[PDB]
Design an enzyme around this catalytic site. Structure first.
Site, mmCIF file in Angstrom:
data_model
loop_
_atom_site.group_PDB
_atom_site.id
_atom_site.type_symbol
_atom_site.label_atom_id
_atom_site.label_comp_id
_atom_site.label_asym_id
_atom_site.label_seq_id
_atom_site.Cartn_x
_atom_site.Cartn_y
_atom_site.Cartn_z
ATOM 1 N N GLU A 1 0.804 -1.220 0.000
ATOM 2 C CA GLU A 1 0.000 0.000 0.000
ATOM 3 C C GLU A 1 0.838 1.272 0.000
ATOM 4 O O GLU A 1 0.516 2.232 -0.708
ATOM 5 C CB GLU A 1 -1.010 0.010 1.157
ATOM 6 C CG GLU A 1 -1.938 -1.216 1.217
ATOM 7 C CD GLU A 1 -2.946 -1.334 0.060
ATOM 8 O OE1 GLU A 1 -2.825 -0.626 -0.965
ATOM 9 O OE2 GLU A 1 -3.875 -2.155 0.185
HETATM 10 N N1 LIG Z 1 -3.006 -9.603 -0.170
HETATM 11 C C1 LIG Z 1 -2.964 -8.363 -0.635
HETATM 12 N N2 LIG Z 1 -1.775 -7.864 -0.935
HETATM 13 C C2 LIG Z 1 -1.670 -6.634 -1.407
HETATM 14 N N3 LIG Z 1 -2.621 -5.765 -1.646
HETATM 15 C C3 LIG Z 1 -3.982 -6.218 -1.347
HETATM 16 C C4 LIG Z 1 -4.160 -7.568 -0.817
HETATM 17 N N4 LIG Z 1 -5.494 -7.875 -0.574
HETATM 18 C C5 LIG Z 1 -6.028 -6.672 -0.986
HETATM 19 N N5 LIG Z 1 -5.231 -5.637 -1.458
HETATM 20 C C6 LIG Z 1 -5.587 -4.287 -1.964
HETATM 21 O O1 LIG Z 1 -6.912 -3.940 -1.494
HETATM 22 C C7 LIG Z 1 -7.527 -3.225 -2.575
HETATM 23 C C8 LIG Z 1 -9.070 -3.154 -2.553
HETATM 24 O O2 LIG Z 1 -9.583 -2.566 -3.798
HETATM 25 P P1 LIG Z 1 -8.868 -2.741 -5.283
HETATM 26 O O3 LIG Z 1 -9.587 -3.833 -6.076
HETATM 27 O O4 LIG Z 1 -8.897 -1.409 -6.042
HETATM 28 O O5 LIG Z 1 -7.323 -3.196 -5.020
HETATM 29 C C9 LIG Z 1 -7.074 -3.982 -3.829
HETATM 30 C C10 LIG Z 1 -5.623 -4.295 -3.522
HETATM 31 O O6 LIG Z 1 -4.785 -3.297 -4.094
#
Ligand SMILES: Nc1ncnc2c1ncn2[C@@H]1O[C@@H]2COP(=O)(O)O[C@H]2[C@H]1O
Length: 254
Positions: free
Chosen positions: A177
């Site tokens: 993130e």
């Molecule tokens: N295991 C994970 N590792 C990294 N990023 C995650 C993970 N699970 C969820 N996310 C992030 O949570 C976000 C929720 O909305 P998005 O689909 O825009 O994109 C998703 C990912 O970027």
């Protein structure tokens, strides 16, 4: 294969920032320019180099993360147990034994364990057993000192799902993130190395990575959105106000 290390024995705000830049520079395709902005964009999926290894180096041991280069999703982690035996834990729909063997060679096949829950935030949060507020990851806060404390719960310890889940929540946010959102990185360095409270804006950014990327990709000209966008924290017209660090791959600009 490629591994980057964050030295938590001697934490430095500059070292953390350079660490995030190494991640961004590793996965980006410099020929991709979305919406006339200078923000880095993740390149097209590679069939050969699929994973990246991140090492959290502490005074009493090292814990590692495995991330998918195509989307920066955390798919596994490495940690020594109470018997100092290296063990790898992975999300089923994310990596194979052969790939895990190549990512974490210090772990034998028998010591590879598939995680019982999903890789999405909701599933992990459920196992984190947070009892206050909305019981989501926001309740844990953020910061270098918090990451160090969370690592302590998995480094050379008997696996406890609650501690593992809390570690994953913080590890994902402090790496993946923070790489995607400079706002998150800036909060970490501004409060370096202290633990601090998270915000609704932090969560709002996270849940709209795809939306923000799509908006810049197809509805933005020279850094200016064609219409006003609101991702939860207010109206934005200039892409620069989003302080993006990494955009999702959506193909080449049309
Ligand atoms: N295991 C994970 N590792 C990294 N990023 C995650 C993970 N699970 C969820 N996310 C992030 O949570 C976000 C929720 O909305 P998005 O689909 O825009 O994109 C998703 C990912 O970027």
């Amino acid at each position: 294969a490629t591994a980057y290390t964050l030295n938590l024995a001697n934490p430095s705000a500059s070292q953390y920032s350079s660490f995030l830049d190494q991640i961004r520079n590793n996965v980006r395709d410099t020929s991709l320019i979305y919406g006339g902005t200078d923000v880095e964009v993740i390149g097209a999926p590679s069939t050969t180099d699929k994973f990246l290894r991140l090492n959290f180096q502490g005074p009493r041991g090292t814990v590692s993360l495995g991330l998918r280069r195509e989307n920066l999703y955390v798919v596994a982690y490495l940690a020594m147990d109470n018997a100092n035996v290296n063990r790898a834990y992975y999300f089923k729909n994310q990596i194979t034994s052969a790939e895990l063997t190549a990512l974490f060679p210090e772990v034998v096949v028998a010591n590879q364990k598939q995680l019982e829950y999903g890789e999405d935030y909701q599933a992990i949060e459920k196992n984190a057993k947070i009892t206050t507020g909305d019981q989501s990851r926001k309740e844990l806060g953020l910061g270098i000192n918090l990451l160090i404390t969370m690592i302590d719960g998995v480094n050379k310890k008997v696996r406890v799902v609650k501690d593992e889940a809390r570690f994953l929540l913080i590890a994902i946010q402090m790496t993946a993130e923070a790489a995607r959102f400079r706002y998150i990185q800036n909060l970490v360095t501004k409060n370096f190395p202290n633990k601090f409270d998270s915000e609704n804006k932090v969560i709002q950014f996270q849940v709209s990575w795809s939306k923000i990327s799509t908006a810049i990709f197809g509805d933005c000209k020279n850094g200016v959105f064609n219409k006003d966008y609101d991702f939860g924290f207010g109206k934005v017209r200039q892409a620069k106000d989003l302080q993006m660090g990494l955009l999702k791959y959506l193909g080449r600009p049309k």
